[PDB]
Amino acid sequence: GSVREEIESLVQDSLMEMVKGVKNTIESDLASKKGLAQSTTEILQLDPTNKAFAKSVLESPNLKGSFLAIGLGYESDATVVENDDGWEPNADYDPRKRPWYVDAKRERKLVVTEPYVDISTKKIIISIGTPVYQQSNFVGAMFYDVELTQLAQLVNSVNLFDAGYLFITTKDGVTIAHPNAENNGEKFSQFLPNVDLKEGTQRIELDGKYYLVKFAQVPSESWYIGAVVDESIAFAMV
């Protein structure tokens, strides 16, 4: 039917606009933070082992304010030179086995992690990870934590004409932004079953009611943006 295709078209417009909005907030913010993280890393490579220097650099106020927290974890122990005022590394914390560290050591390069559960804030964030070198010798890696607070802002600003909403997931189906924030950190299947994580239009039945779902991908992060509408309500509206 034509009404049904119109709904699909409007969902598509809201989806494309959200894709573009993610790119223009998160990605440009990430691009800027990457150069800062890279330079900071090259500066610490002027005297890598010296914890007192790294500490002074990480507590310089512009840096301290551009990231949730920054830290350097050393190859030769589980100690972290950190700038996080509201956190300290508990008895067990081994930097060498956290994603930012492993990814950085693996790639020998600046990396960006998948969204992940932070030890400190317990919310989901992403990290820039950098290898810290000294004469070809790997001595540690750095994290530069980035809050995903803009995602929650994007998602809570759009209501698909009182029929539905948008949400965001990782490539593995983990929800990182949802109007109901209690859904974050859970697989999106928990609230939207029988939907494939793939781009293109799907119609599902859930408790005798019918929903239309569309996904678009944000390729540089490989996040998925989902748009879901209650088809009955939306049919009545349009």
Structure tokens at 200: 């293109």
Contacts of residue 86, defined as CB under 8 A and 6 or more positions apart, other chains included, come to 120
In the complex with Ca ion, the residue whose CB is nearer, 6 or 88, is 88
Structure tokens at 121: 């804030």
- Taking CB under 8 A as the criterion, the residue among 8, 12, 49, 66 binding its own copies is 66
In the complex with Ca ion, the residue whose CB is nearer, 89 or 185, is 89
Binding of residue 84 to Ca ion (CB under 5 A): yes
* Pick from 236, 229, 212, 163: nearest CA to 3: 236
Q: How many residues bind its own copies (CB under 8 A)?
A: 21
In the complex with Ca ion, the residue whose CB is nearer, 5 or 88, is 88
Q: Which residue has the tokens 């317990």?
A: 122
- How far apart CA 32 and CA 238 sit, in angstroms, is 42
- Please calculate the CA angle 171-172-178 and round it to the nearest 5 degrees: 80
In the complex with Ca ion, the residue whose CB is nearer, 82 or 103, is 82
Helix axes 51-59, 28-44, angle to 10 degrees: 150
Structure tokens at 134: 């000294």
**Candidates 4-12, 59-67, 145-153, 211-219; binding stretch for its own copies (CB under 8 A):** 59-67
DSSP letters spanning 83-150: --TT----SS--GGGSHHHHHHHHHTS-EEPPPEE-TTT-SEEEEEEEEEEETTEEEEEEEEEEE-HH
Residue 82's binding partner among its own copies, Ca ion, none (Cβ under 5 to 8 angstroms by kind) is Ca ion
Q: How many residues bind Ca ion (CB under 5 A)?
A: 3
Residue 84's binding partner among its own copies, Ca ion, none (Cβ under 5 to 8 angstroms by kind) is Ca ion
Binding of residue 35 to its own copies (CB under 8 A): yes
Smallest gap from residue 202 Cβ to Ca ion (A): 46
Smallest gap from residue 100 Cβ to Ca ion (A): 17
Q: Looking only at residues 142 through 161 of this chain, which bind its own copies when binding is defined by CB under 8 A?
A: none
Smallest gap from residue 93 Cβ to Ca ion (A): 11
Q: Which residue has the tokens 């998602």?
A: 155
Q: Mapping DSSP to helix (H, G, I), strand (E, B) and coil, where does residue 220 land?
A: coil
- How far apart CA 65 and CA 71 sit, in angstroms, is 14
Binding of residue 82 to Ca ion (CB under 5 A): yes
Residue 236's binding partner among its own copies, Ca ion, none (Cβ under 5 to 8 angstroms by kind) is none
Residue 32's binding partner among Ca ion, its own copies, none (Cβ under 5 to 8 angstroms by kind) is its own copies
Residue numbers at the binding site for Ca ion (CB under 5 A) = 82, 84, 88
Residue numbers at the binding site for its own copies (CB under 8 A) = 24, 28, 31-32, 35-36, 38-40, 42-43, 45-46, 53, 56-57, 60-63, 66
